[PDB]
C-alpha cells in the first residue's frame, strides 16, 4: 500500500510503511462547498472504524486516493 505524499505537481517518497490498511487523506472546507476550502489531506493512520460526518479524513486504502486542490480541482 502506498499514498502520494502531497503530490500536487511533482512527487516525494510515497509508500506508507506503518499502518497496513488505509493511507488517510481527505480535506477540510466548510460544508459541501466544492470550490473553496483550500486545505490538504492527512496521510495514513492505521484504520477508520469510525464514521463521523465533519472531521478532516476517514481513510484511503488505495494507490491514488490523493485528490486535487480546492481552488482548481478539475
Amino acid at each position: 500500500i502506498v499514498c502520494h505524499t502531497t503530490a500536487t505537481s511533482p512527487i516525494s517518497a510515497v509508500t506508507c510503511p506503518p499502518g497496513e490498511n488505509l493511507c488517510y487523506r481527505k480535506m477540510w472546507c466548510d460544508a459541501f462547498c466544492s470550490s473553496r476550502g483550500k486545505v490538504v489531506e492527512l496521510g495514513c493512520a492505521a484504520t477508520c472504524p469510525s464514521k463521523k460526518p465533519y472531521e478532516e479524513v476517514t481513510c484511503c486504502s488505495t494507490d491514488k486516493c490523493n485528490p486535487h486542490p480546492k481552488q482548481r480541482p478539475g
Binding site: 500536487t8 505537481s9 511533482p10 486545505v39 490538504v40
Partner: peptide, 18 residues
C-alpha cells in the same frame, strides 16, 4: 505578537515545482 499565520494548510504549489 504579529504573525498572520495561515489557519489550515495548502496542497497545490508546494515548493519542488522549482
Amino acid at each position: 505578537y504579529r504573525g498572520w499565520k495561515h489557519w489550515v494548510y495548502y496542497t497545490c504549489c508546494p515548493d519542488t515545482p522549482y
